Write an enzyme that holds these catalytic residues in place. Sequence first.
Site, mmCIF file in Angstrom:
data_model
loop_
_atom_site.group_PDB
_atom_site.id
_atom_site.type_symbol
_atom_site.label_atom_id
_atom_site.label_comp_id
_atom_site.label_asym_id
_atom_site.label_seq_id
_atom_site.Cartn_x
_atom_site.Cartn_y
_atom_site.Cartn_z
ATOM 1 N N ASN A 46 7.729 40.857 1.271
ATOM 2 C CA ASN A 46 8.832 40.050 0.782
ATOM 3 C C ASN A 46 10.071 40.174 1.737
ATOM 4 O O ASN A 46 9.941 41.466 2.528
ATOM 5 C CB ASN A 46 9.575 40.834 -0.447
ATOM 6 N N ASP A 52 3.917 41.965 -1.594
ATOM 7 C CA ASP A 52 3.453 41.741 -2.898
ATOM 8 C C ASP A 52 1.990 41.532 -2.886
ATOM 9 O O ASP A 52 1.177 41.680 -1.743
ATOM 10 C CB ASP A 52 3.725 40.314 -2.969
ATOM 11 N N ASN A 59 4.965 42.728 -5.944
ATOM 12 C CA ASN A 59 5.315 43.786 -4.987
ATOM 13 C C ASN A 59 5.286 45.235 -5.330
ATOM 14 O O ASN A 59 5.485 45.496 -6.668
ATOM 15 C CB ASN A 59 6.743 43.346 -4.226
HETATM 16 C C1 LIG Z 1 5.864 37.065 -1.701
HETATM 17 C C2 LIG Z 1 4.713 37.293 -2.895
HETATM 18 O O1 LIG Z 1 3.851 37.450 -2.965
HETATM 19 N N1 LIG Z 1 5.592 37.622 -4.332
HETATM 20 C C3 LIG Z 1 7.244 37.726 -3.987
HETATM 21 C C4 LIG Z 1 7.864 38.620 -5.005
HETATM 22 O O2 LIG Z 1 8.159 40.020 -4.723
HETATM 23 C C5 LIG Z 1 9.220 38.201 -5.787
HETATM 24 O O3 LIG Z 1 9.046 38.341 -6.871
HETATM 25 C C6 LIG Z 1 10.507 39.017 -8.183
HETATM 26 O O4 LIG Z 1 10.904 40.205 -7.331
HETATM 27 C C7 LIG Z 1 12.224 40.344 -7.999
HETATM 28 C C8 LIG Z 1 12.573 41.653 -7.475
HETATM 29 O O5 LIG Z 1 12.491 42.649 -8.290
HETATM 30 C C9 LIG Z 1 11.809 40.739 -9.564
HETATM 31 O O6 LIG Z 1 12.731 40.552 -10.619
HETATM 32 C C10 LIG Z 1 13.524 41.726 -11.356
HETATM 33 O O7 LIG Z 1 12.671 42.177 -12.141
HETATM 34 C C11 LIG Z 1 13.249 43.146 -12.825
HETATM 35 C C12 LIG Z 1 12.090 43.912 -13.403
HETATM 36 O O8 LIG Z 1 10.735 43.375 -13.418
HETATM 37 C C13 LIG Z 1 14.286 42.689 -13.964
HETATM 38 O O9 LIG Z 1 15.007 44.147 -14.434
HETATM 39 C C14 LIG Z 1 15.210 44.217 -15.698
HETATM 40 O O10 LIG Z 1 16.220 43.673 -16.416
HETATM 41 C C15 LIG Z 1 16.426 43.868 -17.600
HETATM 42 C C16 LIG Z 1 17.086 42.579 -18.486
HETATM 43 O O11 LIG Z 1 18.399 42.583 -18.143
HETATM 44 C C17 LIG Z 1 17.027 45.241 -17.942
HETATM 45 O O12 LIG Z 1 16.833 45.505 -19.329
HETATM 46 C C18 LIG Z 1 16.301 46.312 -17.429
HETATM 47 O O13 LIG Z 1 17.278 47.511 -17.132
HETATM 48 C C19 LIG Z 1 15.469 45.755 -15.872
HETATM 49 N N2 LIG Z 1 14.420 46.689 -15.542
HETATM 50 C C20 LIG Z 1 14.713 47.879 -15.181
HETATM 51 C C21 LIG Z 1 13.326 48.659 -15.352
HETATM 52 O O14 LIG Z 1 15.672 48.601 -14.845
HETATM 53 C C22 LIG Z 1 15.200 41.714 -13.453
HETATM 54 O O15 LIG Z 1 15.794 41.150 -14.593
HETATM 55 C C23 LIG Z 1 14.536 40.762 -12.635
HETATM 56 N N3 LIG Z 1 15.457 39.881 -11.755
HETATM 57 C C24 LIG Z 1 16.730 39.121 -12.390
HETATM 58 C C25 LIG Z 1 17.609 39.005 -11.348
HETATM 59 O O16 LIG Z 1 16.583 39.304 -13.611
HETATM 60 C C26 LIG Z 1 10.546 39.878 -10.297
HETATM 61 O O17 LIG Z 1 10.016 40.833 -11.245
HETATM 62 C C27 LIG Z 1 9.480 39.703 -9.228
HETATM 63 N N4 LIG Z 1 8.273 38.703 -9.446
HETATM 64 C C28 LIG Z 1 7.306 38.737 -8.813
HETATM 65 C C29 LIG Z 1 6.072 37.993 -9.483
HETATM 66 O O18 LIG Z 1 7.155 38.838 -7.550
HETATM 67 C C30 LIG Z 1 9.722 36.593 -5.446
HETATM 68 C C31 LIG Z 1 11.105 36.554 -5.606
HETATM 69 O O19 LIG Z 1 11.636 35.254 -5.961
HETATM 70 O O20 LIG Z 1 9.251 36.462 -4.220
HETATM 71 C C32 LIG Z 1 7.888 36.127 -4.223
HETATM 72 O O21 LIG Z 1 7.584 35.572 -3.117
#
Ligand SMILES: CC(=O)N[C@@H]1[C@@H](O)[C@H](O[C@@H]2O[C@H](CO)[C@@H](O[C@@H]3O[C@H](CO)[C@@H](O[C@@H]4O[C@H](CO)[C@@H](O)[C@H](O)[C@H]4NC(C)=O)[C@H](O)[C@H]3NC(C)=O)[C@H](O)[C@H]2NC(C)=O)[C@@H](CO)O[C@H]1O
EC number: 3.2.1.17
Length: 129
Positions: A46, A52, A59
């Site tokens: 990333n 990832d 990731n």
């Molecule tokens: C290149 C490749 O192969 N994959 C790339 C991926 O790395 C990337 O994917 C996304 O990465 C982001 C970064 O973390 C991720 O998004 C955030 O996920 C977290 C937890 O999963 C969420 O957080 C929770 O929010 C809730 C709701 O408000 C809260 O209650 C809670 O307190 C939070 N969790 C904790 C434990 O604190 C976020 O909500 C979320 N982002 C937002 C802005 O809401 C995704 O999970 C990743 N997904 C994947 C499949 O990777 C991707 C980026 O676009 O790039 C790919 O290429």
Amino acid sequence: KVFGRCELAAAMKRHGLDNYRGYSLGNWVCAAKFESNFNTQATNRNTDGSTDYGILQINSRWWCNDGRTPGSRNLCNIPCSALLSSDITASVNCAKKIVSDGNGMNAWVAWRNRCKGTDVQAWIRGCRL
Ligand SMILES: CC(=O)N[C@@H]1[C@@H](O)[C@H](O[C@@H]2O[C@H](CO)[C@@H](O[C@@H]3O[C@H](CO)[C@@H](O[C@@H]4O[C@H](CO)[C@@H](O)[C@H](O)[C@H]4NC(C)=O)[C@H](O)[C@H]3NC(C)=O)[C@H](O)[C@H]2NC(C)=O)[C@@H](CO)O[C@H]1O
């Protein structure tokens, strides 16, 4: 591995993904072509520093341990290399949690835009299921 149009996907249903925790499992198969394109060994880093893994495209920053992810929660608690093999039988536990945050598919990048509002029943359809 190299999985074809009708051969990698009938296994979502062998793992409980069918209509599990509110998302219909019909809605699932499309996105796979969009995350790793039916490949269980395709992975990338990333531009934000955490690599990832898998067809899953996850990731080690927020979810698993690869050793390069400090400030990582390792919410999965399993080596990231523990999913990329031909076998994929235990790899769904963490996938089965990623929707539990209440964030849904808030993690899958391709679906919300490539598979969100698409003719997805036109994706799972046609194989015997
Ligand atoms: C290149 C490749 O192969 N994959 C790339 C991926 O790395 C990337 O994917 C996304 O990465 C982001 C970064 O973390 C991720 O998004 C955030 O996920 C977290 C937890 O999963 C969420 O957080 C929770 O929010 C809730 C709701 O408000 C809260 O209650 C809670 O307190 C939070 N969790 C904790 C434990 O604190 C976020 O909500 C979320 N982002 C937002 C802005 O809401 C995704 O999970 C990743 N997904 C994947 C499949 O990777 C991707 C980026 O676009 O790039 C790919 O290429």
